[PDB]
Design a protein around this nucleic acid. Structure first.
Ligand code: MG
Ligand code: MG
Ligand code: MG
Ligand code: MG
Length: 1341
RNA sequence: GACGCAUAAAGAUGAGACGCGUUUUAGAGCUAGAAAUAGCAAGUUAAAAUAAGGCUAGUCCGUUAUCAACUUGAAAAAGUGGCACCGAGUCGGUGCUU
DNA sequence: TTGTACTCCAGCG
DNA sequence: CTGACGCGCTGGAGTACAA
DNA sequence: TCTCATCTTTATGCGTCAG
């Protein structure tokens, strides 16, 4: 009759078990279907479902964004071809046609094989005249002659296609500001404006600063040494104020016009010209010098004047590459003649032939070639150029991500200015071409769809086609940027039909303070008991404290209000810690801006304040903010408007305006904030207003308030959790279907919450400012002195990593600049391609080029010996952890390896937590579907949420040990123990039912007391318990309910029962059969070959001539019974095989299976005999041997070894020999137990041998492992038992993997033959696997 | 075991961009050569594609989630499988029931 | 001409 | 004034032999 | 790799949600 459900939910696995009130697992004769002779199968009501983990949409999003970027780049090229087409038809009408056609082979080309000129001699002359594209670019920028229009198009097409980054907002003109000689007119301007006529003893320019590094600590001392110092902070020229602005908004030092705050001249210094622009040049020349130092950082040098410095630098790279190539060839011919064939001809040994023609990168070439220069003579210049990473460089290389788009814009503008006179159409539409370069769709606009994309949100003023020239007059940008945010913020939970407040709203902060404040109780010698603060007292302390301090402690309250106002000698205050958690930060910000306290304290003007904050939180683009905020121009002056629109806010709360201040009680007439301001002597906080039935907010909230799949689709978050939710819900209701539609008494779910100590929790959750402070104090730096910061700005991860590394890069030894974090790079230590780890222990802030070089690898050995001292210097300063140092020094230990990949990631933990919480929610809503007028919900099924510590202690205290390496039976065992502990706990203490059941509630540190309470609950299972004094205590061997004589736990029969079912051999292990979805093949593109296995990259691109993809992914296999035209004298041979349907043939096969099968060469196909066989399809063979269908040409292991529980306990006990950490008598008792039972090892190996000879059929590996055991049978028990722990990989269900013994490494035995399963018995297992449909495939065909 | 705030950690979702990488073609290889080839020279760049493709034809979409078998249903979705006892090598045996 | 067995391959910052 | 008890883990390509 | 935004689940501090 009555029964219970136990669940153990994981990311790749759900465990399930059915128990009775007697803790026994039921067993039934389940009916089986199919054409087989079997009609009934005894199955046990315990098992586990296994499935592949759900993938996140990160990779799909990246592929989609790459697709859109490629489409828009092609559209840019199409616009340029359209704007050139009519003039191009005059000079060579087939130029663009050949340009599209360059990929095709000569016999497939319609035009001549030479793309540009259409004839060989002119093409050779072009390549001799312009070896690279940068020759052509520099020639078109610098020369004044009329060039061929084809070269013009090639130049601007190369410029538009590869356009560079958009991280710089300013103009950054390279025509005149790129020159470093501007120091001399800077000091002329200094002499003119500063009326003292100083001597302009001009020394070296900023190149002397850039010789070592660009920083204040070199520039200031260098310029003070070069010219005599007359004013340290007021030298007025080439300052750090003009180049790399200060960290705070500090006032100007030795001001000329006014004292105003200073910053970097990128985007926040435009409002800092109010010294003169608000009262009506060194600052214009300061902008020029900052632009100059940016260009000299980005670009090396140009000796001869030019308007295209990037092409000049590329030309210098080409010339130095040619000179070094000639020198290297001469030296290698003269000194090592035998090595020339390897370096310059063998393209697989990472030589120069491997660096151009092969796949070797720049650093691999440097590391292979570096010993060659050291052993030969005359290679000193090559050695220093290699140490600077400047030897034999290419032009298209990984560090070209740093050059901004403004350099290409200036070069494009120079080309158009040179060529406008000869071609009038260039001058007619110059701005169109510059717009084709410079246009970029804003992130707040998104895709430009027309109602056919689920990712688009933009609205448009007109239905015209969107071009970069008419983007402003078609796309309504304001509503698009609004809907960029309103589509992403959540609704209010209590009021589901309207939006939440911003975090920095004055109403939200007011509600937060008045919610925290209204429960503060004060006591003194005056009266007997603490009393709540009255509304007048609350208003007085808010006006006296919270509007005068951004952050306030209780000490200031005690010594300033209660000492002075309503004077008392000493007051004790409860309800708050040392610091109030709420603060009126926005009030202080707007008081600092507006300079009108009365304006903020007014009640009538609260709505415009709210809309101002809503605007300032929604929008961030400058024109947009002033567009919305111009309505308030009749209250605010122009300067205070220019200051207020800078106050950027981000973050939104959880409640709505109607909730906190819109709805009113029908009797009292007060809002929720009105009650928090004053509620008489009740002083009710927010939860008390929303749950007291006296106030009328409650039923208003209830008036404010279907199949399973749509109940899943509407819940937000990652789609990966939906897989686990759906699988476990299907498990649950299938189990209810199994037991005759009867609901359980209770469902026990193993939830991943813990309990820990108050001190431990507070130590693990302290603010990161304390971390930075004690680390910097330990290493004794002064970085915090020069760059002040608070705890709030460390939320930004780049600034946090900058303070973590003590202002320096930790890959190379140079000082970082805090104001230029846009170009520095945050990289993962263990790369994203290998292991998913976004922890702070895996993140480095480094320079961009050094990250781009360190690609898809652990940082190499050389940088480890370079910076290993600084890594230890940060390690002992508690700024980086031991895991961070281990990952940083991973290259010393062999680098990337198979062992490094193996392991559990924290994303599994977070995903499991989200899953099991949602499972508890959905099962509670589904199982309890009935209610009455008086009781709001009937507890038909009590969902019980146990924590992992209780079940872990139950396993570790009664020798029910688990390891994951032998079998997947541990999930079912964990589910069973979950159910047993849950039902025994809910039966032993009926008045703790509200603690564990979902939706119910009960009423030294609090967490410490709760942790001890949870620890002391489990003791009633035990027979003898040792108290903390070391003295034992007894409990009855039969446990009872206490309030009733009903019996809850027999330490005899029930322990025998729980031992019986943990040795239970038949456990329903089901691998979910899934049709594969995703990319159809591996992304690597293989060269041309005569093989037929290459996949065509395009419809007209034959892979025999163009290459293509390989390694296709099969969606599912299909059993086909048909005739094959075999033989030269052809006859129709009837035959049955599997055929793999790939991803791109899935739609074609589903559209018409018959035509697709005759397209593959089959004929006379039986239509009704087509069986869809997905991945992990289960088949059954002789002697109970089961094979899982991995693919159409590869099988998998499908049998599970049911090892006895005594061997499992012995294997867990023999390993972890000296790390149990119990008591010495326990440790000794396990020691003698494993020493007198050392013969269990041979029994385990005999069991493994019998199981493998039965179902695995890897005889060679079996002889190998028996011989290797017989070699190492005299080893200590620890290493042995650890290696038989590894040994079950051979017998583990799944794919055959490579394990290892003591020294021998066993290669996997692959089942690359799906011929045997064609005469097998196909098993169609249900979600729980209890219902089966066995189809005998030998009767087919 | 839920909610508001403060401090954490570990993760998700969407948009806009950049730099490489891979492939085919173009960048006339020379000499000795019956040659299988050998010697020498050269190498840095460009185009096109970057999921096949799809139709509502947009500067849009196409790698997440869904998916045992059978009977209905375009699909959505609905429905289909006795119990008790004694045992255990992946489940077996015995006894009532329509 | 068809099955096997052993080793290598796999977009990324 | 409330209850008790001292979370994982490979299929396909390429080359080389048995018939 | 960069720049913008929005969330989620857990761990502590405080308050609260009931009869
Ligand atoms: Mg668990
Ligand atoms: Mg990196
Ligand atoms: Mg488990
Ligand atoms: Mg899928």
């Amino acid at each position: 009759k009555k029964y219970s459900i136990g669940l153990d939910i994981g990311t790749n696995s759900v465990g399930w078990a059915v128990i009775t009130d007697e803790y026994k697992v039921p067993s039934k004769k389940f009916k089986v279907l199919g054409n087989t002779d079997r009609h009934s199968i005894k199955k046990n009501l315990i098992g586990a479902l296994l499935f592949d983990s759900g993938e996140t949409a990160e990779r799909t999003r990246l592929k989609r964004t790459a697709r859109r970027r490629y489409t828009r780049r092609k559209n840019r090229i199409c616009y340029l071809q359209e704007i050139f087409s009519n003039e191009m038809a005059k000079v060579d009408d087939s130029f663009f046609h050949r340009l599209e056609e360059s990929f095709l082979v000569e016999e497939d080309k319609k035009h001549e094989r030479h793309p540009i000129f259409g004839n060989i001699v002119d093409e050779v002359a072009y390549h001799e005249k312009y070896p690279t594209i940068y020759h052509l670019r520099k020639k078109l920028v610098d020369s004044t002659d009329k060039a061929d229009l084809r070269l013009i198009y090639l130049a601007l097409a190369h410029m538009i296609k590869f356009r560079g980054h958009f991280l710089i907002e300013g103009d950054l003109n390279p025509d005149n500001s790129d020159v470093d000689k501007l120091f001399i007119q800077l000091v002329q301007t200094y002499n003119q404006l500063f009326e003292e006529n100083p001597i302009n003893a001009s020394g070296v320019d900023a190149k002397a600063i850039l010789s070592a590094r660009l920083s204040k600590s070199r520039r200031l001392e260098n310029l003070i040494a070069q010219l005599p110092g007359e004013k340290k902070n007021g030298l007025f020229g080439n300052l750090i104020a003009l180049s790399l602005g200060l960290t705070p908004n500090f006032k100007s030092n030795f001001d000329l016009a006014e004292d105003a705050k200073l910053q970097l001249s990128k985007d926040t210094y435009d409002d800092d010209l109010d010294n003169l622009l608000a009262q009506i040049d060194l600052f214009l020349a300061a902008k020029n010098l900052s632009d100059a130092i940016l260009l000299s950082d980005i670009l090396r040098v140009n000796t001869e004047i030019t308007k295209a410095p990037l092409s000049a630098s590329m030309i210098k790279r080409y010339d130095e590459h040619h000179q070094d190539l000639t020198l290297l060839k001469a030296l290698v011919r003269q000194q090592l003649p035998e090595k020339y064939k390897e370096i310059f001809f063998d393209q697989s040994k990472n030589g120069y032939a491997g660096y151009i023609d092969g796949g070797a990168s720049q650093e691999e070439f440097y590391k292979f070639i570096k010993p060659i220069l050291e052993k030969m003579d005359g290679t000193e210049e090559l050695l220093v150029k290699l140490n600077r990473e400047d030897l034999l460089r290419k032009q298209r290389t990984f560090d070209n991500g740093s050059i901004p788009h403004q350099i290409h814009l200036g070069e494009l503008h120079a080309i158009l200015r040179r060529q406008e006179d000869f071609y009038p159409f260039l001058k007619d539409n110059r701005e169109k071409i510059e717009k084709i370069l410079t246009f970029r769709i804003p992130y707040y606009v998104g895709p430009l769809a027309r109602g056919n994309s689920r990712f688009a949100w933009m609205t448009r003023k007109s239905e015209e086609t969107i071009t970069p020239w008419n983007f402003e007059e078609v796309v309504d940008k304001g509503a698009s940027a609004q809907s960029f945010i309103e589509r992403m913020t959540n609704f209010d939970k209590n009021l589901p039909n309207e939006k939440v407040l911003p975090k920095h709203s004055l109403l939200y902060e007011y509600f937060t303070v008045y919610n925290e404040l209204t429960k503060v109780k004060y006591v003194t010698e005056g009266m007997r008991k603490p009393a709540f603060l009255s509304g007048e007292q609350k208003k007085a302390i808010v006006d006296l404290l919270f509007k005068t301090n951004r952050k306030v402690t209780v000490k200031q309250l005690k010594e300033d209000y209660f000492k002075k106002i309503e004077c008392f000698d000493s007051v004790e205050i409860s309800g708050v810690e040392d610091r109030f958690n709420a603060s009126l930060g926005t009030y202080h910000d707007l008081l600092k801006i507006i300079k009108d306290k009365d304006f903020l304290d007014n009640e009538e003007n609260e709505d415009i304040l709210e809309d101002i904050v809503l605007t300032l939180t929604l929008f961030e683009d400058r024109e947009m903010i002033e567009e919305r905020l111009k309505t308030y121009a009749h209250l605010f002056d122009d300067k205070v408007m220019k200051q207020l629109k800078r106050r950027r806010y981000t973050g939104w709360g959880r409640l709505s305006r109607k909730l906190i201040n819109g709805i009113r009680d029908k009797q009292s007439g007060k809002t929720i904030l009105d009650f928090l301001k004053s509620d008489g002597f009740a002083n009710r906080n927010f939860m008390q207003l929303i749950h007291d039935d006296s106030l009328t907010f409650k039923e208003d909230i209830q008036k404010a308030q279907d199949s399973l799949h749509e109940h899943i689709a509407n819940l937000a978050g990652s789609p990966a959790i939906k897989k686990g939710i759906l699988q476990t819900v299907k498990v649950v209701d299938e189990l209810v279907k199994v037991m005759g539609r009867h609901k359980p008494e209770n469902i026990v779910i193993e939830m991943a919450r813990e309990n820990q100590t108050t001190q431990k929790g507070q130590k693990n959750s302290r603010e990161r400012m304390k971390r930075i402070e004690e680390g910097i104090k330990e290493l004794g730096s002064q970085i915090l002195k020069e760059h002040p910061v608070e705890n709030t700005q460390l939320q930004n991860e780049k600034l946090y990593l900058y303070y973590l590394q003590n202002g320096r890069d930790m890959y190379v030894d140079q000082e970082l600049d805090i104001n230029r974090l846009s170009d520095y790079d945050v990289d993962h230590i263990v790369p994203q391609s290998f292991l998913k780890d976004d922890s702070i222990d895996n993140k480095v802030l480094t320079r961009s080029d050094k990250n781009r070089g360190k690609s898809d690898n652990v940082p190499s050995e050389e940088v480890v010996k370079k910076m290993k001292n600084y890594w230890r210097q940060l390690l002992n300063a508690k700024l980086i952890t031991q895991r961070k140092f281990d990952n940083l020094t991973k290259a010393e230990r062999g680098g990337l390896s198979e062992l490094d990949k193996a392991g559990f990631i924290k994303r599994q933990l977070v995903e499991t937590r989200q899953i099991t919480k949602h499972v508890a929610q959905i099962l509670d809503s589904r199982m309890n579907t009935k209610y009455d007028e008086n009781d709001k919900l009937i507890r038909e099924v009590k969902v019980i949420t146990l924590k992992s510590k209780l079940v872990s202690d139950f396993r570790k205290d009664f020798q029910f040990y688990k390891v994951r390496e032998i079998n997947n039976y541990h999930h079912a065992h964990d589910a069973y123990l979950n159910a047993v502990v849950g039902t025994a706990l809910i039966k032993k203490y009926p008045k703790l039912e509200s603690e564990f059941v979902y939706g119910d509630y009960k009423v030294i540190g609090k967490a410490t007391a709760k942790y001890f309470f949870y620890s002391n609950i489990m003791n009633f299972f035990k027979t003898e318990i040792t108290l903390a004094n070391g003295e034992i205590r007894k409990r009855p061997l039969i446990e009872t309910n206490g309030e009733t004589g009903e019996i809850v736990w027999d330490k005899g029969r029930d322990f025998a029962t729980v031992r019986k079912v943990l040795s239970m051999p038949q456990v329903n292990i089901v691998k979910k059969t899934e049709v594969q979805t995703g990319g159809f093949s591996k992304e690597s593109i293989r060269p041309k070959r005569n093989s037929d296995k290459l996949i065509a990259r395009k419809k007209d691109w034959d892979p025999k001539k163009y290459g293509g993809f390989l390694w296709p992914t099969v969606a599912y296999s299909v059993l086909v019974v048909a005739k094959v035209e075999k033989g030269k004298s052809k006859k129709l041979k009837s035959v049955k095989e599997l055929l793999g349907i790939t991803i791109m043939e899935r739609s074609s096969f589903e559209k018409n299976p018959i035509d697709f099968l005759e397209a593959k060469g089959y004929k006379e196909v039986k239509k009704d005999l087509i069986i869809k066989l997905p991945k992990y399809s289960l088949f059954e063979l002789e002697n109970g041997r089961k094979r899982m269908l991995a693919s159409a040409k590869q099988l998998q292991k499908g049998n599970e070894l049911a090892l006895p529980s005594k061997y499992v306990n012995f294997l867990y006990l023999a390993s972890h020999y000296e790390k149990l950490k119990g008591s010495p008598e326990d440790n000794e008792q396990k020691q003698l137990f494993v020493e007198q039972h050392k013969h269990y090892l041979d029994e385990i190996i005999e069991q493994i041998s019998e199981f493998s000879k039965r179902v695995i059929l890897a005889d060679a590996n079996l002889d190998k492992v028996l011989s290797a055991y017989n070699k190492h049978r005299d080893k200590p028990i620890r290493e042995q038992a650890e290696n038989i722990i590894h040994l079950f990989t051979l017998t583990r269900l799944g794919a055959p993997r490579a394990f290892k013994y003591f020294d021998t490494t066993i290669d996997p035995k692959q089942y690359r033959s799906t011929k045997e399963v064609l005469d097998a018995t196909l098993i169609h297992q249900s979600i729980t696997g209890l219902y089966e449909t066995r189809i005998d495939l030998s009767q087919l065909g």
